[PDB]
Swiss-Prot record:
PTM entry text: Ubiquitinated; undergoes heterotypic 'Lys-48'-/'Lys-63'-branched polyubiquitination catalyzed by ITCH and UBR5 resulting in proteasomal degradation. Deubiquitinated by USP5, leading to TXNIP stabilization.
Gene Ontology CC entries for this record: cytoplasm; cytosol
Subunit and partners: Homodimer; disulfide-linked. Interacts with TXN/thioredoxin through its redox-active site. Interacts with transcriptional repressors ZBTB16, ZBTB32 and HDAC1. Interacts with DDIT4.
Species: Homo sapiens (Human)
Name of the protein described by the UniProt record: Thioredoxin-interacting protein
């Protein structure tokens, strides 16, 4: 797709379910079918409150984010702090490490221990000059949810 063979978020431990204060670590990986100039690879990691009305009232009460982390990532084995466009060539994996820590408190709420009131995910964005930005999105799972009516 416009030179792009693959674009994905890969967690270092694909089976890990994350709790309070824990590091979420992974890579954004790009592969191309032909030479292409890349301006940036960015991430947005969010924990978004879901809104759910049941039993005649709002249960998942929604409101504000638990997490919103934005960054521009560095290609593996490039100099730290450097601002440089990348010429991606076929036959190579272009890997960008990321890592963020989750908040110390509860990571969200749950209704009747069945309906999780929060969505966590990582989006990545592939920016290229005079070309539409491409997006990828991957969900991740959390624990440390508390009941909606917890004091």
């Amino acid at each position: 797709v416009a030179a792009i063979k693959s674009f994905e978020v890969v967690f270092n431990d694909p089976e890990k379910v994350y709790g309070s204060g824990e590091k979420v670590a992974g890579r954004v990986i790009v592969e191309v079918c032909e030479v292409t100039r890349v301006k940036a690879v960015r991430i947005l990691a969010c924990g978004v409150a879901k809104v759910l009305w049941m039993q005649g009232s709002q249960q998942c009460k929604q409101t504000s984010e638990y997490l919103r982390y934005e960054d521009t990532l560095l290609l593996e084995d490039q100099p730290t702090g450097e601002n440089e466009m990348v010429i991606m060539r076929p036959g190579n994996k272009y890997e960008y490490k990321f890592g963020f820590e989750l908040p110390q408190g509860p990571l969200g709420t749950s209704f009747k221990g069945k309906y999780g009131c929060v969505d966590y995910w990582v989006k990545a964005f592939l920016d290229r000059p005079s070309q539409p930005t491409q997006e990828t999105k991957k969900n991740f799972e959390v624990v440390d949810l508390v009941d909606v009516n917890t004091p």
